Amino acid sequence: PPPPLSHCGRAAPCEPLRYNVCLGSVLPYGATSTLLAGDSDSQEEAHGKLVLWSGLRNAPRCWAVIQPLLCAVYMPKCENDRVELPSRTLCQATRGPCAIVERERGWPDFLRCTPDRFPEGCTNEVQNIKFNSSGQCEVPLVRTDNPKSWYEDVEGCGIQCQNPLFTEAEHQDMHSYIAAFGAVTGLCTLFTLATFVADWRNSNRYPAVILFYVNACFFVGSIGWLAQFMDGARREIVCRADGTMRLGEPTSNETLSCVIIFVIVYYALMAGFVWFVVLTYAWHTSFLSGKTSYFHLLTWSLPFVLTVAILAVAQVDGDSVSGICFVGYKNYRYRAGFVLAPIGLVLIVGGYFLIRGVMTLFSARRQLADLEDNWETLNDNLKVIEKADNAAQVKDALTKMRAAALDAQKKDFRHGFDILVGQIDDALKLANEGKVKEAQAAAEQLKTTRNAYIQKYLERARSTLSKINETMLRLGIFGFLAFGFVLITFSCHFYDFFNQAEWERSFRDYVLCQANVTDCEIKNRPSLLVEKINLFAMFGTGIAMSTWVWTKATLLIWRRTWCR
Numbered sequence: 001p002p003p004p005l006s007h008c009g010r011a012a013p014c015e016p017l018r019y020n021v022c023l024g025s026v027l028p029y030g031a032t033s034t035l036l037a038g039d040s041d042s043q044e045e046a047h048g049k050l051v052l053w054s055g056l057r058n059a060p061r062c063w064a065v066i067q068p069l070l071c072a073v074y075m076p077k078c079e080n081d082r083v084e085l086p087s088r089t090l091c092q093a094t095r096g097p098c099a100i101v102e103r104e105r106g107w108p109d110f111l112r113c114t115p116d117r118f119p120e121g122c123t124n125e126v127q128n129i130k131f132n133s134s135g136q137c138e139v140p141l142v143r144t145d146n147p148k149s150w151y152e153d154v155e156g157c158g159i160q161c162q163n164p165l166f167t168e169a170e171h172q173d174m175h176s177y178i179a180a181f182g183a184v185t186g187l188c189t190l191f192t193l194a195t196f197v198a199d200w201r202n203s204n205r206y207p208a209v210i211l212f213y214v215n216a217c218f219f220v221g222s223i224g225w226l227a228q229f230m231d232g233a234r235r236e237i238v239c240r241a242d243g244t245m246r247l248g249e250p251t252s253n254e255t256l257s258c259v260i261i262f263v264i265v266y267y268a269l270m271a272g273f274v275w276f277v278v279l280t281y282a283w284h285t286s287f288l289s290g291k292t293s294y295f296h297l298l299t300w301s302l303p304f305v306l307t308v309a310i311l312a313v314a315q316v317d318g319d320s321v322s323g324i325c326f327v328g329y330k331n332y333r334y335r336a337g338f339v340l341a342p343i344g345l346v347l348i349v350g351g352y353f354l355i356r357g358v359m360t361l362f363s364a365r366r367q368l369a370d371l372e373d374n375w376e377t378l379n380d381n382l383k384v385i386e387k388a389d390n391a392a393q394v395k396d397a398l399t400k401m402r403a404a405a406l407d408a409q410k411k412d413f414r415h416g417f418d419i420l421v422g423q424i425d426d427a428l429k430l431a432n433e434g435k436v437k438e439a440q441a442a443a444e445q446l447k448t449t450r451n452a453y454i455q456k457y458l459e460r461a462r463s464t465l466s467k468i469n470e471t472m473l474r475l476g477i478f479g480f481l482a483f484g485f486v487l488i489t490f491s492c493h494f495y496d497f498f499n500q501a502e503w504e505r506s507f508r509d510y511v512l513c514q515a516n517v518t519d520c521e522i523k524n525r526p527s528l529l530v531e532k533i534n535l536f537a538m539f540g541t542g543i544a545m546s547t548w549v550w551t552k553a554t555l556l557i558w559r560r561t562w563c564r
């Protein structure tokens with residue numbers, strides 16, 4: 001029994017302990033003092049302050065070091081009218097893990113590690129006392145030892161893998177939607193690819209070959225989206241090794257599984273849009289075999305660059321609702337710059353080719369509509385000269401035929417119309433002179449020039465309009481239909497980015513309030529039905545482009561291979 005040092009003590013009247021327990025541990029000493037605790041001026045009041053301090057049970061790292069400190073200040077050892085001052089080593093041990101205390105409320109003057117009221121080289125009785133109460137994390141926080149997993153300053157607790165803003169039943173509902181849409185797309189797109197490889201001889205040709213790689217992109221995308229449906233795959237792709245949600249991937253000492261599924265989904269998504277722009281450019285140029293090298297470069301290099309960029313900045317995060325890893329689930333700025341930015345460009349570039357595509361379709365359609373209008377004006381006015389008996393009537397119909405000839409005129413075509421124009425002038429002089437018989441005979445000469453040379457150009461014009469009937473219009477229908485779905489996808493990704501500033505605030509507010517309790521309400525969360533609309537647009541194009549081989553010719557392709 002050695003006598004303790006003068007500086008490690010403080011002269012105080014020692015009153016007996018009311019409670020024989022401090023924060024779930026027995027006390028050996030009998031007397032205490034309420035002067036070390038500034039706020040407390042009674043033992044009952046000290047226990048009333050200790051029960052508020054015990055609210056730090058959550059966050060084990062702080063709770064493990066604050067328990068011997070709180071008992072050394074509020075319920076300390078008092079013997080021979082002197083209270084034991086707590087050692088600075090016991091005090092400094094809290095400064096680090098209990099950094100949350102300084103931030104949330106701030107350390108009081110009596111609980112600050114100053115050389116006075118906290119001296120060095122002092123042996124405490126609380127140091128001998130062992131506390132077994134620790135390791136408590138309030139859900140949605142899960143107990144983890146990984147420092148790169150601890151949510152905010154709550155050292156010891158990390159954010160759980162399952163999204164706390166959505167229920168277990170709601171997850172099941174979204175996963176049922178992804179399974180159904182994924183399987184239908186997966187089977188439809190594979191069928192198209194199987195039909196294309198079966199007739200590869202004829203199939204590897206523009207513009208049909210474009211749709212083959214389009215489907216290939218939607219097939220790979222389906223594999224990545226359906227990957228979560230393997231036993232325990234969703235809680236391997238989206239969940240970290242400790243059980244926390246995956247963030248900032250590629251991260252150190254963690255399975256590549258997350259960035260694998262991200263690369264498969266995002267790359268096949270982006271390459272699908274570059275192949276869409278190729279399809280729209282093909283519909284523009286239809287009105288290309290030597291450009292195959294240029295097509296395959298941009299469709300596989302540009303998405304590669306964007307994917308490598310995301311992996312370099314490490315912005316791959318995982319959502320339990322989607323069941324896949326993606327760019328910018330946490331930091332939406334990186335999502336907009338890598339999802340809305342390229343999808344924004346494909347609507348500008350791809351759309352421009354669809355606009356100039358219909359522009360040329362209706363321009364060439366108008367050319368024959370105007371030339372057939374002038375053909376009838378010539379035919380009807382010739383019947384007027386035939387019907388006419390007056391020299392003024394013949395003169396009137398020839399002047400109408402002359403204006404219609406010049407209107408239809410605007411080298412092989414120019415030479416032919418000059419003969420007709422010249423013949424009208426030769427006929428016009430006869431009408432001016434008063435001759436009706438000679439002018440009517442001259443009009444019949446225009447019929448022979450029309451019936452053998454001008455007729456051939458009209459026949460060639462009507463034939464080109466019949467060329468547009470099937471494939472020329474089919475590619476356009478698929479191009480506009482795909483554009484529609486891309487416009488839906490853009491709107492859904494934009495809606496998310498728009499409200500992600502408030503959804504971050506509401507997610508943070510719900511997790512931090514549930515961290516401590518002896519009700520918490522979700523302010524606002526992202527709309528799942530809008531996410532279902534996005535998946536309807538994504539998988540919708542997958543099935544919509546799969547209908548290219550939905551022709552009568554493909555039925556005979558499968559019948560021929562059946563015999564083989």
Ligand SMILES: CS(=O)(=O)c1ccc(C(=O)Nc2ccc(Cl)c(-c3ccccn3)c2)c(Cl)c1
Nearest residue numbers: 319321322326329496503504507526531534535
């Ligand atoms: C509240 S938060 O943590 O900011 C958060 C949480 C979840 C999301 C979110 O929308 N997740 C999600 C949930 C479900 C789906 Cl299907 C998707 C999706 C849709 C289309 C393409 C790829 N993934 C995405 C977002 Cl943007 C933000």
Ligand SMILES: *[C@@H]1O[C@H](CO)[C@@H](O)[C@H](O)[C@H]1NC(C)=O
Nearest residue numbers: 052055056104512513515516
């Ligand atoms: C629990 O943590 C919140 C901050 O997330 C804080 O406002 C609250 O005071 C803490 N509870 C206790 C009892 O200290």
